[PDB]
Amino acid sequence: HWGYGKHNGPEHWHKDFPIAKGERQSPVDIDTHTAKYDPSLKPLSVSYDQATSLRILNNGHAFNVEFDDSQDKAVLKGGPLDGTYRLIQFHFHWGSLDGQGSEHTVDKKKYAAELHLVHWNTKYGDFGKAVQQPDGLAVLGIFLKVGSAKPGLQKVVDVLDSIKTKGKSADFTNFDPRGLLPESLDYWTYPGSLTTPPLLECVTWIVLKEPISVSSEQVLKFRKLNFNGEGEPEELMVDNWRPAQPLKNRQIKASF
Numbered sequence: 269h270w271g272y273g274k275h276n277g278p279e280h281w282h283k284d285f286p287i288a289k290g291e292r293q294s295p296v297d298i299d300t301h302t303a304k305y306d307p308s309l310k311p312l313s314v315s316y317d318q319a320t321s322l323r324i325l326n327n328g329h330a331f332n333v334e335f336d337d338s339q340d341k342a343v344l345k346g347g348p349l350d351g352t353y354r355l356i357q358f359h360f361h362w363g364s365l366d367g368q369g370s371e372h373t374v375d376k377k378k379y380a381a382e383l384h385l386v387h388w389n390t391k392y393g394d395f396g397k398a399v400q401q402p403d404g405l406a407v408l409g410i411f412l413k414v415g416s417a418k419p420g421l422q423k424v425v426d427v428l429d430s431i432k433t434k435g436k437s438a439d440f441t442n443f444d445p446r447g448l449l450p451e452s453l454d455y456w457t458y459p460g461s462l463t464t465p466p467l468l469e470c471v472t473w474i475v476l477k478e479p480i481s482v483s484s485e486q487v488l489k490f491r492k493l494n495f496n497g498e499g500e501p502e503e504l505m506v507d508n509w510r511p512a513q514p515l516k517n518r519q520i521k522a523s524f
């Protein structure tokens with residue numbers, strides 16, 4: 269099945285998911301000089317105060333922190349979005365090396381990692397219905413460079429030992445996702461897709477311009493994660509990013 273190596277990687281995915289070569293694929297390169305400031309963008313609203321995490325999960329591709337989304341608690345609204353999108357989970361993609369790992373790039377510059385906070389459009393009643401919709405999801409993308417530690421990330425780093433291999437999960441309640449955000453909400457936005465199979469074209473992308481900084485030793489611990497399940501040969505979870513895809517006519521709008 270799909271993965272990130274030579275034989276099952278992003279270059280192979282189109283075979284099971286033809287949409288891989290579609291008209292609104294993610295990620296993209298953000299050409300900062302070509303993105304237009306857009307005055308009809310409302311201010312962005314990230315309300316994460318009442319966010320309730322349930323658990324952390326290694327799914328053999330990344331690790332997912334999953335949230336209770338049965339009630340309106342953690343929502344993204346405003347910016348390019350119409351109505352209310354509920355936070356359901358977040359995850360990261362990262363590299364074997366500090367100079368690679370993000371999915372989006374900024375004038376071709378790759379960051380050490382990229383975090384994705386995933387929200388679904390509440391007009392559609394459940395997450396399952398929204399992903400079948402062109403405006404079904406909003407993903408908040410955040411870059412990670414290597415520098416000083418992100419204190420608000422270390423509870424995630426420490427729990428990773430518990431979820432080394434595919435299929436492992438741990439209780440992970442009361443994680444507050446606000447500690448992962450940078451100061452600025454300046455952003456680029458574009459219409460796009462899931463960056464993993466099924467690569468569905470249901471995503472409004474909102475990518476923060478300001479990177480967060482994490483320590484060398486924090487990213488180093490991401491890299492100790494395994495793609496494999498318990499008691500299979502050891503394949504380190506690194507370089508789980510999809511490269512930039514063709515822009516194809518789309519415009520990237522800047523909020524600033």
Ligand SMILES: CCN(C(=O)OC[C@@H](CO[N+](=O)[O-])O[N+](=O)[O-])[C@H]1C[C@H](C)S(=O)(=O)c2sc(S(N)(=O)=O)cc21
Nearest residue numbers: 269270327329332357359384386407461462463464465
């Ligand atoms: C959690 C990351 N995802 C994902 O499919 O990872 C692996 C598959 C595994 O597929 N598989 O081999 O059975 O799903 N999973 O076992 O959690 C999906 C899951 C769901 C479709 S999601 O939470 O709406 C989501 S958003 C993104 S991203 N990178 O564009 O911001 C990606 C995803």
Ligand SMILES: [Hg+2]
Nearest residue numbers: 400401469470
């Ligand atoms: Hg869709």
Ligand SMILES: [Zn+2]
Nearest residue numbers: 359361384463
């Ligand atoms: Zn992602």
